[PDB]
């Protein structure tokens, strides 16, 4: 980043030393934390549960959220809508997420299978099959409403649930801003990277932004001072950037701990 | 705990990070930052004060930038440590000083107790959790049509091994006989879906 | 190109450089599409592969065998296995998905296993335990365990303090 | 040994460690200058009637 394979910059950077090894350590920490976040959220189930083909859930249509086999990536229709909603050569690289999107899809599939067939006991110990009507009756007991209300209104509640799922489909398909937060995240990252790219065009007090131009124009004795100015500028930009992204990754980790707390409490109970 | 040291890895990492930062600071005293040397005494002994001032200005800018970078790193790290400490205090308040019904917030399984133990720059909770071990299948039913009146279990499950019917708890197997006090009556046995006799 | 120095894969360009457009530029003042000085003809640039070199190892005490993962580089360039994170040199690719130890990336992980060697595969997300659901079957626990787990939490850090002048 | 040097102190343990940066080095250097100025009628300064 600081220099496109210019040895004079390499040496004048050895003058500074660990100023970038620091940065690399920080960024590696960030990446590891990202991995940990993903595992915290999704890798809370132990065994991958699989839904049985018998969709006898008492009218609760779950096709729209259970994984569709036909798709190459085994993803639920809702997840497809979400995927459609959300849309250099200077050391700037994007490492791949350890968990592929398909493994995360299978994790959510296992979580749905657990919370549908076993309800919540799959999170405490081993999954315990239980008729979905009785599981919703236990949830109603948890709310404060008695089982009779559910069992007497099973069809009406099923219809309301299916219509609500349809409304969710419509809201996700039409209003892209429903996923705004995620988009913002991506945008922020992209913005930062782009700004880094653009920082390569600033002079920082030197004659040019191309170390090759400086070395071709000025003699090495003075080209060294100019390259020192340029290196200071670019290193300061890198420090600013890694600090921005450290703070942003801290915020992302906060939100990820919140999401894991949810996944544990609401989903698994 | 005795065998696997990595059980406390997190705490070690914390310490390591701190040490690392400090060591790096030490090593920053060896960088030139564009001056002739890293020893201001050497600069002053070599160069005249008029130019030694510019060289010392370069060195001071470098070392001050290193200090700013370091204090920023440690500000962020202390923010993270404060987040983890607020989490630990929330635990100490909920699980230790009570019983947290938040599922899997206090150990995988139904949380019974916890026991805090100090550790260098950290805490270790002995989350005592209930975990149901052995499982048995049973034929169940939402309600029971006794005399045309649907009978619902007051608290528990209607279970049936394959011959009789009983009422049990949702986390242990105490099959009790279905009296009129383990169940409450509600409506007829047609609105119910799956009611048995 | 007329003093313009730059490195990269030089392909041809369909990019319409109007006659006054000899060389292009990028967002980082780097030329992207160039042209010929002698016999005027247009060209494209893609800087050829740089990439990371990451070493996968079990513990040195366990073994000294190494699996070198080249990230952002296809070893078409440089027991070789192509991943999506990059490509491995020194690791046979097994198809049997096990619970993974050394996360390589893009879903692929490695581990030391037998003739002991480093093997790479795809992550087994867990034993595919299909729960036998039924509309009238329930599972009741008859016996339980009292398992105690350890939860480690960093509370404080070294309360350091620096003097600026010193 | 590269990894042992990256950790800068100890003997490596289980895991993966980013060590270095491979780069496909340029095969050679292409130099292309023009005759600078388009054309002059030397063929008439010499082969004049
Ligand atoms: C539950 O969801 C399924 C799947 O969307 C519905 O079945 C679809 O019905 C429409 C309209 O007849 C067809 O065009 C689709 O081809 C069907 N899909 C499949 C996979 O069969 C089903 O009708 C829904 N049930 C209710 C009551 O909402
Ligand atoms: C309670 O509200 C539900 C709707 O949430 C009512 O169910 C609707 O009843 C009307 C009239 O029969 C139907 O046209 C709708 O299609 C029903 N909706 C659903 C989701 O089934 C229900 O009748 C109401 N009950 C009372 C006693 O008011
Ligand atoms: C279901 O459980 C009941 C109660 O334990 C079993 O009935 C018992 O059967 C034994 C053996 O014949 C008798 O000695 C007991 O007196 C019976 N108890 C009752 C409540 O009558 C029943 O056999 C079990 N059914 C199955 C298929 O396991
Ligand atoms: C519980 O008893 C009722 C009443 O005897 C059973 O419902 C009868 O089912 C038979 C066979 O389908 C019908 O011919 C009768 O007309 C039904 N009677 C009524 C009043 O609906 C019911 O099937 C029994 N349930 C169980 C689990 O044995």
Short mmCIF file of C-alpha atoms and ligand atoms in Angstrom, two decimals, chain A residues 155-157 159-161 163, ligand 2:
data_model
loop_
_atom_site.label_atom_id
_atom_site.label_comp_id
_atom_site.label_asym_id
_atom_site.label_seq_id
_atom_site.Cartn_x
_atom_site.Cartn_y
_atom_site.Cartn_z
CA UNK A 155 -57.09 -23.35 12.61
CA UNK A 156 -57.62 -19.61 13.08
CA UNK A 157 -54.13 -19.15 14.55
CA UNK A 159 -54.40 -18.99 9.14
CA UNK A 160 -53.23 -15.81 10.87
CA UNK A 161 -49.66 -17.13 10.98
CA UNK A 163 -51.10 -14.67 6.29
C1 LIG E 2 -60.95 -12.96 15.73
O1 LIG E 2 -60.16 -12.39 14.69
C2 LIG E 2 -59.94 -13.28 13.59
C3 LIG E 2 -59.04 -12.61 12.56
O2 LIG E 2 -57.74 -12.39 13.13
C4 LIG E 2 -61.27 -13.68 12.97
O3 LIG E 2 -61.05 -14.61 11.90
C5 LIG E 2 -61.58 -14.04 10.68
O4 LIG E 2 -62.99 -14.19 10.58
C6 LIG E 2 -63.55 -13.56 9.42
C7 LIG E 2 -65.06 -13.73 9.42
O5 LIG E 2 -65.38 -15.13 9.45
C8 LIG E 2 -62.94 -14.17 8.16
O6 LIG E 2 -63.46 -13.52 7.00
C9 LIG E 2 -61.43 -14.02 8.20
O7 LIG E 2 -60.84 -14.65 7.06
C10 LIG E 2 -60.90 -14.67 9.47
N1 LIG E 2 -59.46 -14.51 9.55
C11 LIG E 2 -58.66 -15.54 9.80
C12 LIG E 2 -57.20 -15.21 9.92
O8 LIG E 2 -59.08 -16.67 9.92
C13 LIG E 2 -62.15 -14.32 14.03
O9 LIG E 2 -63.43 -14.64 13.47
C14 LIG E 2 -62.32 -13.35 15.18
N2 LIG E 2 -63.14 -13.95 16.22
C15 LIG E 2 -64.07 -13.25 16.87
C16 LIG E 2 -64.89 -14.03 17.86
O10 LIG E 2 -64.26 -12.07 16.66
#
